[PDB]
Amino acid sequence: STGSATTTPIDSLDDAYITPVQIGTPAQTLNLDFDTGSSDLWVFSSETTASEVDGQTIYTPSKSTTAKLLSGATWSISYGDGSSSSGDVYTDTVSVGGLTVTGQAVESAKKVSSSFTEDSTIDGLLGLAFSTLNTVSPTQQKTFFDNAKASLDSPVFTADLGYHAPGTYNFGFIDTTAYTGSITYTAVSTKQGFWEWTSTGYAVGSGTFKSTSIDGIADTGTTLLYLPATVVSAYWAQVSGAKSSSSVGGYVFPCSATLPSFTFGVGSARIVIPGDYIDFGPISTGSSSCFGGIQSSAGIGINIFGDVALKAAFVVFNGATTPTLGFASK
Template sequence: MKFAVSSAAVAVSLVALVPGALTAAVAKNKSPTAGRNIEVTKEMLEVSVVGGQTFRAPQVLNTGFMQQGRGPRAMAKAYAKFGLQIPPELLLLLEEILLSLGITPGSGGIAGGSGSSGSSGSSGSSGSSGSAGGNASTDAGQGMVAAIPQMFDAEYLAQVTIGTPPQTLNLDFDTGSSDLWVFSSETPKAQQGGQKLYNIAASTTAKVLAGATWNIRYGDGSSSSGDVYLDTVSVGGVTVQNQAVESAKQVSASFSSDAASSGLLGLAMNSINQVQPTPQKTFFSNAMADLAMPLFTANLKKSEAGNYNFGFIDTTEFKGSLSFIDANITNGFWQFESGGFSVGNSSTATITSFPHQAIADTGTTLLFLPDGIVNAYYGQIRSAVNSQAAGGFIFRCDEALPNLTLAIGSYNAVVLGGFMNLAPTSTKDASGAQMCFGGVQSSAGFPFSIYGDVFFKSQFVVFHGGNTQLGFAPKA
């Protein structure tokens, strides 16, 4: 049933998909051909009463966020998240960052640990073999990653309530993992860093999931682990009862250092959930049947809080039409193929063919791409240099940076050059000019490219669980 609203109301209302409109468009255009896009115009996304629920999850500022060392931190976090061995030169750089912050390398970390040989990767990996030996050793310097403040990475968080009566926690929404884990009343005080805790005993609806445990191993040898409770979880007014909540009984110090973040809410596929012996469903998977449409959108922004919308698409948040492409969920991620790229600000630039597999990951800061694309991009920046001392590609902070266009099927996603300047480094060039860390870095060593927050700040992205598709459009 349609309803009339004023133009003023439309601007703030929840805009929901007309029942079946997107599904019909998909059915009409569905093709087994990889890279085939489905265009959905704004006219197909009308204001309607559709039944089912919709909600907006606005982000909130992490008041502990710091810029210092942000580039190397983001690099190390990505290596650790996907169970990869962190390069020795990056470890040395991180040691310098720790010392500059007054943190002793290895403190609270995993020096002397047994490493992660044969580990199954992190919450973001899907059974990847991990790194033989990991980075842990009897050398204290090898344990340093676990002690670096997580505040460098999670600039914005989102509010989630758990339990009865509801307890509000700020969590990091992550489309590259599938666990909902939190600091809790079971977390040792020595591993707490001022986080708001999930008080299990205070919730009348909490019940232990007998025999269930979780253990997320990272590429630096550190880990987070604990047991599992079923409890009521709400985000933006949508409630899931008996949601698996992973209670941390042991936490890597990299998470303990961030007082503002109480944990993680994973939004990837159920298959890579780390609960044993039986993987548990994500919040989104459990909530899908009650949503007006089985999807959520990510509208992340630069230097300000963005939002996630569940069950509806807000047409005021993007320009033009949405371009949908099939997601490959075999490995548990929102994975897709990109066909090529171009560098520069011309809208008519020719796309250079460079096929590569990628995942859409809001839990990774940087944009990790194949060397051929990264080298082509920085080849257009006069002062750019791949610096071991800085941990990756850097350039003068006053450089005017070109756009990077990435072809996703027939859709060309433009990543604005202004978003490629991640943060200042401690490095200066020969003239004394400040150097900044690049937002795009090499994906060498990763099993796929990672389209992280640098990409999301230019693109409005739809994660359609019902059709296992991704939709892209330029931000409004």
């Protein structure tokens, strides 16, 4: 089997991407944030505190004939941006783009934090990191990909995120028409539960390539590119008027400046992030100060190849016995 679904930016800045997901019988379609940095499939639901729901589409398990309470199970997750949610668990039928998993753990939110309430476009998350990060207790549950894996034609999924445009998530096959050149594969460590790999270096605009190991995660659920402070400083030093603003919480730059590209290494291959991808617009409406899409990872404790980086590539998440990551230009 295979599946293929279109993923769509939630807003004009590509702050996140939503993908339609069918849950239950009859199908209830929710727009979920596919997140290769976490491993819980959770949804806004009929059980969510009423004051914490504002415009989201909810899953109602009582209306699904295939829904079963996972008795005694609870879940509770916190994300890197301080947001969080928690609740109980049902198993139900979940389909993505024609690919169906029966008995998928669907984590029903009883509580969500403010940032989730305040975003009407995201109905929940569908985690695609390793199942060892799943927060369900007492019995940890498997991700959608983990459950699907053995039925897939090939044990892989791919992320093809668009710049200010829709893209595609595919399961079970590699669309050879979706990228240029070759796919370069690179080693993955699963020790922290992430798609964790080591970039071979970077270049800023037309600058020479700096060979240096950068350990980080391929994280579709993170908007920006978070790299070591040395690297980020070298980037913004090439932008006239750019500065790190404590009040804003990162590098900003005059909206009138031209942004250089940023290149990252994948083995001997190179992925080029165009300068425009690094522009996240005015810090507040009407401001001439624009927020940067490359920021310091200092104090996160890990480097994050988020959407800014991944959308410049066709990315293979290879779930073979020994997982690997592949990157192609497109």
